[PDB]
Amino acid sequence: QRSVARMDGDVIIGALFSVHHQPPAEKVPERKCGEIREQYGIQRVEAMFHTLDKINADPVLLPNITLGSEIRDSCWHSSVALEQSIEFIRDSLKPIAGVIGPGSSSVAIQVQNLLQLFDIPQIAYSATSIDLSDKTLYKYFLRVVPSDTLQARAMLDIVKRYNWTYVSAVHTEGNYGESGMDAFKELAAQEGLSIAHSDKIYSNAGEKSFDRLLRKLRERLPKARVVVCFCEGMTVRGLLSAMRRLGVVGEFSLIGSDGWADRDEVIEGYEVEANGGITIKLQSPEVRSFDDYFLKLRLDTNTRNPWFPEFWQHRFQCRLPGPNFKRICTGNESLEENYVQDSKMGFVINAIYAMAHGLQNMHHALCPGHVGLCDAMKPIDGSKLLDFLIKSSFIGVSGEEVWFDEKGDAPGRYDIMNLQYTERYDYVHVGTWHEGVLNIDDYKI
Amino acid sequence: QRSVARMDGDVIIGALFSVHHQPPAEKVPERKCGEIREQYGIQRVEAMFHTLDKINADPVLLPNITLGSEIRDSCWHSSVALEQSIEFIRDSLKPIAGVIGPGSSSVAIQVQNLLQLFDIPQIAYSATSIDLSDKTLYKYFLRVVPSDTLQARAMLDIVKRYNWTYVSAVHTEGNYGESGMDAFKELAAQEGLSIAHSDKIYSNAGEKSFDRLLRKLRERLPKARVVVCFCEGMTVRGLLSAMRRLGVVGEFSLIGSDGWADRDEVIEGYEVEANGGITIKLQSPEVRSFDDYFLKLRLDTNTRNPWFPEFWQHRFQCRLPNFKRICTGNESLEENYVQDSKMGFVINAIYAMAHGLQNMHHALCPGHVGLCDAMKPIDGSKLLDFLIKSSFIGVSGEEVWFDEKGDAPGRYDIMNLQYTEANRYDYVHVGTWHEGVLNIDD
Ligand SMILES: N[C@](CC1c2ccccc2Oc2ccccc21)(C(=O)O)[C@H]1C[C@@H]1C(=O)O
Numbered sequence: 001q002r003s004v005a006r007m008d009g010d011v012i013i014g015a016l017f018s019v020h021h022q023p024p025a026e027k028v029p030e031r032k033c034g035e036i037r038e039q040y041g042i043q044r045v046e047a048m049f050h051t052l053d054k055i056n057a058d059p060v061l062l063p064n065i066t067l068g069s070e071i072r073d074s075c076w077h078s079s080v081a082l083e084q085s086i087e088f089i090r091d092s093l094k095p096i097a098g099v100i101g102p103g104s105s106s107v108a109i110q111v112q113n114l115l116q117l118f119d120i121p122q123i124a125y126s127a128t129s130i131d132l133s134d135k136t137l138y139k140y141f142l143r144v145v146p147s148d149t150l151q152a153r154a155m156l157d158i159v160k161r162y163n164w165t166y167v168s169a170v171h172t173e174g175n176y177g178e179s180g181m182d183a184f185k186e187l188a189a190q191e192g193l194s195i196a197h198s199d200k201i202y203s204n205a206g207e208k209s210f211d212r213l214l215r216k217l218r219e220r221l222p223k224a225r226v227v228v229c230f231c232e233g234m235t236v237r238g239l240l241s242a243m244r245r246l247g248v249v250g251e252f253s254l255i256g257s258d259g260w261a262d263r264d265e266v267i268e269g270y271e272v273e274a275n276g277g278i279t280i281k282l283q284s285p286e287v288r289s290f291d292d293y294f295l296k297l298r299l300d301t302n303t304r305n306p307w308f309p310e311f312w313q314h315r316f317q318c319r320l321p322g323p324n325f326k327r328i329c330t331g332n333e334s335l336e337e338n339y340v341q342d343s344k345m346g347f348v349i350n351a352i353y354a355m356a357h358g359l360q361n362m363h364h365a366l367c368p369g370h371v372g373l374c375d376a377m378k379p380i381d382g383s384k385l386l387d388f389l390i391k392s393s394f395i396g397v398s399g400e401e402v403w404f405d406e407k408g409d410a411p412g413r414y415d416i417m418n419l420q421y422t423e424r425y426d427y428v429h430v431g432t433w434h435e436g437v438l439n440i441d442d443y444k445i
Numbered sequence: 446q447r448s449v450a451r452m453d454g455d456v457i458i459g460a461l462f463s464v465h466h467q468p469p470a471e472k473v474p475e476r477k478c479g480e481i482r483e484q485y486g487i488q489r490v491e492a493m494f495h496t497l498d499k500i501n502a503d504p505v506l507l508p509n510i511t512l513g514s515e516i517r518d519s520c521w522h523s524s525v526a527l528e529q530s531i532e533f534i535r536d537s538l539k540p541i542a543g544v545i546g547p548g549s550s551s552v553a554i555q556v557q558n559l560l561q562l563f564d565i566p567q568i569a570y571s572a573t574s575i576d577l578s579d580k581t582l583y584k585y586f587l588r589v590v591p592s593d594t595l596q597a598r599a600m601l602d603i604v605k606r607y608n609w610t611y612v613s614a615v616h617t618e619g620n621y622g623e624s625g626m627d628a629f630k631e632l633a634a635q636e637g638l639s640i641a642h643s644d645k646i647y648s649n650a651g652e653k654s655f656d657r658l659l660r661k662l663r664e665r666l667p668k669a670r671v672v673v674c675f676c677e678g679m680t681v682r683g684l685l686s687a688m689r690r691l692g693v694v695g696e697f698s699l700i701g702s703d704g705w706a707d708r709d710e711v712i713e714g715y716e717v718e719a720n721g722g723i724t725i726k727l728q729s730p731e732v733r734s735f736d737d738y739f740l741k742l743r744l745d746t747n748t749r750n751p752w753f754p755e756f757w758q759h760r761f762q763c764r765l766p767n768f769k770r771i772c773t774g775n776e777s778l779e780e781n782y783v784q785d786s787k788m789g790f791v792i793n794a795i796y797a798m799a800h801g802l803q804n805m806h807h808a809l810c811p812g813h814v815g816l817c818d819a820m821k822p823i824d825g826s827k828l829l830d831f832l833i834k835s836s837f838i839g840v841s842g843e844e845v846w847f848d849e850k851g852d853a854p855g856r857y858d859i860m861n862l863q864y865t866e867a868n869r870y871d872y873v874h875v876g877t878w879h880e881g882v883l884n885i886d887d
Pocket residue numbers: 103104105106126127128129130175176231232233258259
């Protein structure tokens with residue numbers, strides 16, 4: 001009985017977005033979700049509607065075959081995503097040709113385990129886990145976002161650029177830190193790099209554990225000034241805090257993964273200790289054409305997004321008479337107010353274009369000379385569509401070239417930043433790692 | 446379509462058994478399974494039929510409610526088990542009231558993630574993962590086999606019985622080793638035991654890693670003679686082989702989890718360095734009544750088991766397309782016969798289901814003969830509650846019950862590797878750990 005955002009067309013593309021937060025602890029068994037989300041939820045629902053409209057109006061891509069949608073809420077939760085994925089396949093047990101999403105790797109894995117049983121290709125836009133490259137387990141999965149293994153690669157390229165042969169290695173416990181570090185250490189051993197102090201830090205580690213980590217790192221100075229951190233941001237923060245307690249500054253060169261990236265909250269109150277840090281993050285340029293569409297949406301005319309009323313009330317802290325807020329909505333409020341575009345918007349859009357390019361390629365091969373769908377695509381053969389998707393390529397929404405390797409994995413493009421004192425402290429852009437190629441301003445770093 | 450072993454009844458019990466081995470590597474995408482299995486497969490299918498027959502004949506348990514079955518093949522594989530679990534619920538898209546199995550914890554987790562969405566209770570007979578006690582994730586899961594956390598408890602009770610105050614600790618990387626050792630350490634930190642050297646290793650790690658392990662261990666001597674190993678067998682083997690390469694013997698007292706248990710392949714070739722080792726394993730008392738039924742099965746009579754002809758041909762190497770001889774239907778099941786070591790648990794899991802149903806009936810249909818409107822259909826969330834509160838005497842005389850997390854009591858054998866009063870190295874039975882009570886003989 002959960003809401004579904006729909007658009008009819010010749011071929012239906014499924015999607016799972018986090019329209020709401022996960023069930024609160026108490027709401028878990030009933031699968032009742034948390035509050036509505038804009039950036040991970042409403043913005044993505046809307047980007048999908050608008051992208052399908054653009055593809056449909058495009059005479060060059062799928063000229064005679066229209067795309068529709070069936071967009072479901074994952075609530076950033078494995079149980080709900082699975083419940084909703086069953087809804088995709090329920091009638092078969094218009095079928096969906098493939099699925100965009102869900103957002104997180106643990107949830108994407110749950111969904112893939114179901115989808116693959118029905119030969120439904122799945123294209124992720126933000127799931128970066130290294131496990132998902134395993135095609136013996138996840139045959140039907142592919143993605144337009146780089147695997148975290150390319151972080152390990154980039155960080156090692158940075159180390160090698162400056163001719164270091166020893167480094168220390170710290171990671172956070174859990175899939176993200178451990179598999180990222182495992183990838184780094186595997187490459188390091190192949191390429192002549194030696195590990196000094198190695199440590200795995202728990203999510204709940206106290207000040208004493210951090211104190212000790214700092215002691216172990218300082219023991220290897222000065223031979224191992226470089227500390228490679230495949231770390232969640234609060235692991236980095238715990239190290240900075242230990243530095244403060246000991247009263248030491250600037251002994252190390254910290255190289256951090258995107259758990260740290262350019263997050264102010266990691267270094268707030270500890271800028272002096274963090275200064276000099278090198279970090280990476282996914283490149284994600286804003287998509288202007290999304291803003292042009294989204295910022296113009298109106299409560300009264302947006303009928304196709306069934307969650308838009310719930311959103312409008314939350315967004316403008318108001319109520320629609322006929323539940324928590326005093327103000328009565330006018331419908332004339334401005335979405336520009338405090339507006340921030342989903343940082344992953346470009347990947348969401350490219351994943352949808354990817355689905356469209358796979359279908360076009362399928363049509364060229366299976367229905368040559370036939371206007372629109374032919375019998376060979378009635379219904380669409382998911383196993384064949386997977387093959388076509390993997391071999392598809394195109395220029396994505398920000399000018400980058402989108403394509404997939406044999407494992408369904410994407411190329412990687414990261415920004416390299418260096419925390420610096422300015423005249424405030426800023427994460428200064430010092431270069432990029434672009435599809436295997438590191439480029440850094442050595443002078444600025 | 447994959448075969449299904451069925452039996453009609455008023456209430457249908459699902460089951461997933463490893464009737465076949467998992468798909469060979471090249472078969473994985475088509476979900477075509479490996480070869481037929483006896484102990485993990487065919488025996489379990491049969492025990493389920495016969496147990497249901499026995500319950501249905503019983504005048505006291507479920508008087509005028511017949512239990513049926515829909516037994517499916519998991520092929521010891523997440524993907525196949527999930528495909529088959531989807532088949533169970535296809536009805537809702539006679540419904541299944543609950544599910545027995547599958548065998549492995551990682552496969553059981555995958556099945557539970559699907560079953561819980563349809564409020565179908567699931568009872569495991571061999572999935573021992575500590576993870577499965579998390580009722581926020583696995584609300585509809587319960588089991589008649591002890592969580593591996595009770596191995597850690599039993600191991601600590603052994604350590605304390607001998608007044609040891611310091612131990613070293615080794616575990617295999619991954620869920621089994623890490624979760625077992627986390628439990629042990631958590632208990633040790635509550636009860637005055639100190640950990641000297643602590644280490645983790647993969648089974649596939651090289652000799653250089655085991656060299657470093659043993660080197661690191663020997664440094665914490667002479668005060669840390671005892672090594673607690675929550676280890677898969679090949680981790681123990683990696684340590685025994687590092688011991689030979691250094692030429693050391695009898696310097697440690699090894700206390701091993703059921704990864705080691707009484708396995709010959711762990712110690713073969715290293716009997717002398719493994720000697721004196723202490724291990725535990727789940728008790729598995731043989732079920733006489735299963736032997737009496739199973740050993741009398743005939744190819745021509747057994748029509749309800751669709752896998753029986755495939756099993757017969759493989760068991761007696763004949764045809765009815767790989768072997769030359771034609772099966773008579775007369776060959777004896779008693780040759781090289783071994784009963785599934787988990788047979789007691791399989792049966793108890795089935796009885797647990799029946800008792801849950803009975804208790805639901807007593808409460809919801811009080812005084813009624815057979816199913817009343819309140820149990821048409823069976824409300825899975827209610828049945829879960831009734832299962833959790835059920836208790837009964839199991840097939841071997843043990844008391845079966847569940848705590849609030851669906852977890853079972855634990856009974857382990859304790860064994861000691863010894864040089865016998867002959868000239869052979871044997872795993873000798875030295876005691877038991879019975880539901881919190883440690884009993885050892887000198
Ligand atoms: N890329 C994410 C997150 C990525 C990650 C990958 C694998 C396992 C854990 C894990 O958690 C962290 C933690 C810190 C930094 C990056 C990750 C994904 O879940 O795939 C991202 C969609 C999730 C989101 O936006 O929250």
